[PDB]
Design a protein. Structure first.
Lengths: 44, 96, 139
């Protein structure tokens, strides 16, 4: 299953390239605007 | 160690027995791991090592959670390169 | 995420490496001064043949053998919960990316003195291999 899926993406080649490019910037945007706190509120 | 006894040296084993031929199929599946292995353990311990030094706010809970992995990632590799092999060379003999 | 980075690189390299010795055989079986963009296209996409599933399912392992942690109830659960989440998202990320981009990125772009200290003790482990398994249980 895994091997066949490798050939799919390799075929995609370019279209995937800009997919991980635009997702990289989008991802860079989320982190810039992400809230922050010491720990994850653990109060009952 | 499986595809080593699944390549061309795996044409001699299934048909007849040859200790010094299955030993060669293991000695190559041993130098072929040397490169990927030694670096896998490296980058896993290297990228895990900074959080083992508990200085700063929060380091306390991260060092407690990295030491088991870091310390557990020295006996896991070191030993598995001798226990896994010398155990597969023993199971392959049972079914045979 | 801190622990996630330790494996996200283990996804790329273990694949890249199995492609480094695959380009060290086609170079030994064929000439040397002749290679095209397609001739280099086949040798690296053939390292995705063996270790391909080996890592996607192993990084699927790292993530799932960890799931049982989410069953932490209350204070403890709210704590290491988000740590498991981010650790899992980032693993399924560098795993689902190591099967879509990592192969392409590596195609678009003293090992001696450690091998000599290992195999003296490796051929030694093949001495009554049931003796080293006796030493193991003692560990």
């Amino acid at each position: 299953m895994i091997e066949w899926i490798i050939r799919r993406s390799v075929a995609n080649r370019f279209l995937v390239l800009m997919g991980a490019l635009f997702l990289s910037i989008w991802g860079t945007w989320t982190i810039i605007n992400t809230p922050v706190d010491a720990l994850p509120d653990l109060s009952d | 160690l499986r595809h080593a006894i699944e390549a061309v040296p795996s044409l001699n084993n299934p048909q007849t027995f040859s200790e010094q031929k299955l030993d060669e199929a293991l000695y190559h599946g041993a130098v072929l791991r040397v490169r990927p292995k030694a670096m896998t353990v490296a980058v896993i311990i290297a990228g895990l090592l900074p959080i083992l030094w508990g200085t700063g706010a929060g380091s306390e809970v991260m060092s407690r959670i990295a030491a088991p992995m870091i310390g557990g990632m020295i006996t896991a590799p070191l030993l598995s390169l001798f226990i896994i092999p010398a155990a597969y060379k023993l199971m392959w003999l049972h079914r045979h | 995420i801190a622990i996630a980075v330790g494996a996200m690189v283990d996804a790329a390299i273990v694949m890249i490496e199995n492609a480094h010795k695959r380009l060290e055989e086609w170079q030994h079986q064929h000439p040397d001064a002749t290679l095209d963009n397609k001739t280099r296209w086949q040798v690296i996409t053939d390292a995705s043949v063996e270790v391909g599933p080996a890592l996607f399912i192993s990084l699927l392992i790292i993530t799932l053998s960890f799931i049982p942690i989410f069953t932490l109830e209350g204070q403890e659960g709210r704590l290491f919960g988000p740590l498991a989440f981010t650790k899992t998202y980032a693993m399924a990320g560098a795993a689902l990316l190591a099967i879509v981009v990592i192969p392409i990125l590596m195609g678009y772009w003293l090992n001696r003195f450690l091998i000599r200290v290992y195999h003296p003790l490796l051929l030694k482990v093949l001495h009554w291999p049931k003796t080293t398994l006796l030493v193991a249980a003692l560990s």
